[PDB]
């Protein structure tokens, strides 16, 4: 069985703050004596292009208001790093978790804590897509909502700060160094993301989960090797497959090689007409190998 | 957009404890000076039918171990209430949230905090089906994982304790009074749940969500009234629709009457062939009216 789940949010909830500059309000993340938030908070109200260098030069500290659960924090200084601000505050968060900062790569799964006015409202798992966007559920005010992962030793990896929604509905964020994923602009514009590719590593994991649930009507006895599959994937909207050996735990429990699943992807690429696999009517790239193994075996 | 999300888990994480009796380990929920957990924890190791009254009669308090983050709570007394135990402990949980106990009805959405050995591992939203099961993701050791909702005023509604996985893969739990949802047996058996019905209320909410995203190819021009739909619903595996008055906010913005959606359900009852609605190839009863309203408008 497979369910997209989030890792527990409690340690991240204790870091979320409300950041206001003038009338503009969004979310930030308070670790130690630093609050990180999108620099959009200092943008002037205007319909023309934002000159953030100018806004930063004219910025005054007294225009900031930063609070955690309605308790206001004093602002000591502010510096700008790409698309984020680093706000130094006059006291440290006593609930700062053990943490690091990590930049995601396409195909990485992570957790979003959707926040509004410094208050978390929801949490869900997501995948960074090949076009460097995610499919979230955000409404007005979610800017600065953090993305995270929790390592096995309990270390929180801070990896995402929500920045903008594109005209297509795709969501764009930055890492905590201020680099926007996919090099999108952090202000309204007419930019469009590139076509989404199916995450082949995730589809292989999905088909192994199907096999382990007794669903195998689709299984191909043909084999396609990695080099051949990667050339096919180029022409058919799929990513390369990264490797084969990481699936050995599932290859052994089933009797099925990764190369058989690569052939099966090519066989199922257009549709199931009109059967289903684990309830899905087309191939699913929602679940990583790590998620399948964790949810099926606890590893 | 429509995404299944969970409400943040921090306030519930601080209530999960590890409950051990002999060698048997599961999860409990620590509120005030009471820990509630499934009575399965006192079951003998055997393949015969469990007599829980006899297990309770032979129980010894010193066989219990109850711990939070590796520190042990002194057990003072234990009573059995249906399928749960209420363990009195000598310390109160200083992180007990404002809370009530609520019994779910089919069609209700709630959050599951999946836990193992008293430690939370995942959080996800589920919906109670008409056969009083949920489709979660659990492996061995998840017994006692709590289900909750958080009210607008901050009150946590505790509504579910995970009990068993059926042969089908569906999951069964109890409420905090010890009543098993659907009155399934809380021990290994061959029980088969009745077939699920489509939750018509949730399908209506889902079609309102599609309208608000410009997805309208499926809208019937004609209408069916509630009485006519409910007659059809019996014959075709759908629940009766509750009322038309609830959807007025959706009926306003769209602005489509519930009767037009009920007619659309009748036409879309068979497949979409081969179109899709918000990515789905069939009607989705995953989302309640409250969820759609909260996710679209923050209310």
From Swiss-Prot, chains A, B:
Residues 1-299 form the Peptidase C30 domain. It comes from Human coronavirus NL63 (HCoV-NL63). This is 3C-like proteinase. Responsible for the majority of cleavages as it cleaves the C-terminus of replicase polyprotein at 11 sites. Recognizes substrates containing the core sequence [ILMVF]-Q-|-[SGACN]. Inhibited by the substrate-analog Cbz-Val-Asn-Ser-Thr-Leu-Gln-CMK. Also contains an ADP-ribose-1''-phosphate (ADRP)-binding function. The active site is at residues 40, 143. The chain holds residues 2941 to 3239 of 4060 of the full protein.
């Amino acid at each position: 069985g497979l369910k997209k789940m989030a890792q527990p949010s409690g340690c991240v909830e204790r870091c979320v703050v409300r950041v206001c500059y003038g009338s503009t309000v969004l979310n930030g993340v308070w670790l130690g004596d630093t609050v990180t938030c999108p620099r959009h908070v200092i943008a002037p109200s205007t319909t023309v292009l934002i000159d953030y260098d100018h806004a930063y030069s004219t910025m005054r500290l007294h225009n900031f208001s930063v609070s955690h659960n309605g308790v206001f924090l004093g602002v000591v200084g502010v510096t700008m790093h790409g698309s984020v601000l680093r706000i130094k505050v006059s006291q440290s968060n006593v609930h700062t978790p053990k943490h690091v900062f990590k930049t995601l790569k396409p195909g990485d799964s992570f957790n979003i804590l959707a926040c509004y006015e410094g208050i978390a409202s929801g949490v869900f798992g997501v995948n960074l897509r090949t076009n460097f966007t995610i499919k979230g559920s955000f409404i007005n005010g979610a800017c600065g909502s953090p993305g995270y992962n929790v390592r096995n030793d309990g270390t929180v990896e801070f990896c995402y700060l929500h920045q903008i929604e594109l005209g297509s509905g795709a969501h764009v964020g930055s890492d905590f160094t201020g680099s926007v994923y996919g090099n999108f602009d952090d202000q309204p514009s007419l930019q469009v993301e590139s076509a989404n590719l199916m995450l082949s590593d995730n589809v292989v994991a999905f088909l192994y989960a199907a096999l382990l649930n007794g669903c195998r009507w689709w299984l191909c006895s043909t084999r396609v090797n990695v080099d051949g599959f990667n050339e096919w994937a180029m022409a058919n909207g799929y990513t390369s497959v990264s490797s084969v050996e990481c699936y050995s735990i599932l290859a052994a429990k089933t009797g099925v090689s990764v190369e058989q699943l690569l052939a099966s992807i090519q066989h199922l690429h257009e549709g199931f007409g009109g059967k289903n696999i684990l309830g899905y009517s087309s191939l699913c790239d929602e679940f990583t190998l790590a998620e399948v193994v964790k949810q099926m075996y606890g590893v």
